Amino acid sequence: IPCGKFAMYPAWQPDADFQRQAALWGVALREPVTAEELAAFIAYWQAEGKVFHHIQWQQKLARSVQISRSSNGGMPQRD
Amino acid sequence: IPCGKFAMYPAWQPDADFQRQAALWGVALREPVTAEELAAFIAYWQAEGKVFHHIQWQQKLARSVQISRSSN
């Protein structure tokens, strides 16, 4: 994991306690982030080129998944 | 149509009827995939290096685009 602000990169992962960190930011996640959802978020942001701290990326990921799942009652879609 | 399993490459394109083929997998896309969305998906999956049939790549693209649009 890079220090400072960095651009998204394919091998990136949230911290192992991501569910609890998302909850302390106001995001309840009924299941953990799926591999599909992570790959979708990384793909998008690596191309957008914006840079952020590891912390801010994780906050973006929590909310992106919260918003994505909201049409499905907080559930991810099956593979 | 490229045949067999293959890895992602810069020139890949989904079929020209991709939006309604994106429906047969459960993904409704109201608007067509942009070059930005396609290019982002190729770059990423090029890094993962995995191989798939054309059919499966298009399914992943649809789901990937569905999830991207639904966030915001």
Which of B43, B48, B63 is facing A46, going by the closest CB pair? B43
CATH topology of domain B1-72: Helicase, Ruva Protein; domain 3 (1.10.8)
Resolution in A for the shown PDB structure? 2.3
Kindly determine whether residue B70 and residue A65, on different chains, have CB atoms separated by under 8 Å: no
Q: Which two tokens stand for residue B1?
A: 């149509």
Q: Do residues B18 and B58 make contact, with C-beta atoms less than 8 angstroms apart?
A: yes
User: Does A24 touch chain B if contact means CB atoms closer than 8 Å?
Assistant: no
> What span, in angstroms and rounded, lies between the C-alpha atoms of A34 and A43?
14
Q: Do residues A37 and A65 make contact, with C-beta atoms less than 8 angstroms apart?
A: yes
Q: Which two tokens stand for residue A33?
A: 């982030």
Bridge partners, B6 (sequence order)? B52
Which of B26, B40, B66 is facing A44, going by the closest CB pair? B40
> Taking CA atoms, what residue in B is nearest to A63?
B71
Residue B44 distance to chain A (closest CA, Å): 5
A18, containing H or E segment: helix A18-24
How many of the other CB atoms lie within 10 Å of CB of B49? Answer: 9
Query: In the PDB record, what is the listed experimental method?
Result: X-ray
Return the number of CB contacts < 8 Å for A and B: 52
Q: Which two tokens stand for residue B64?
A: 């990937």
User: Does A75 touch chain B if contact means CB atoms closer than 8 Å?
Assistant: no
Alpha-helical runs (H) found in B1-72: 18-21, 35-48, 54-70
Strands A51-52 and B6-7: unpaired
Q: Which of A73, A5, A62, A1 is nearest to A37 (CA)?
A: A62
Q: Do residues A28 and A60 make contact, with C-beta atoms less than 8 angstroms apart?
A: no
Question: What burial class does residue A49 get, using C-beta atoms within 10 Å of its C-beta: 0-12 exposed, 13-18 middle, 19+ buried?
Answer: exposed
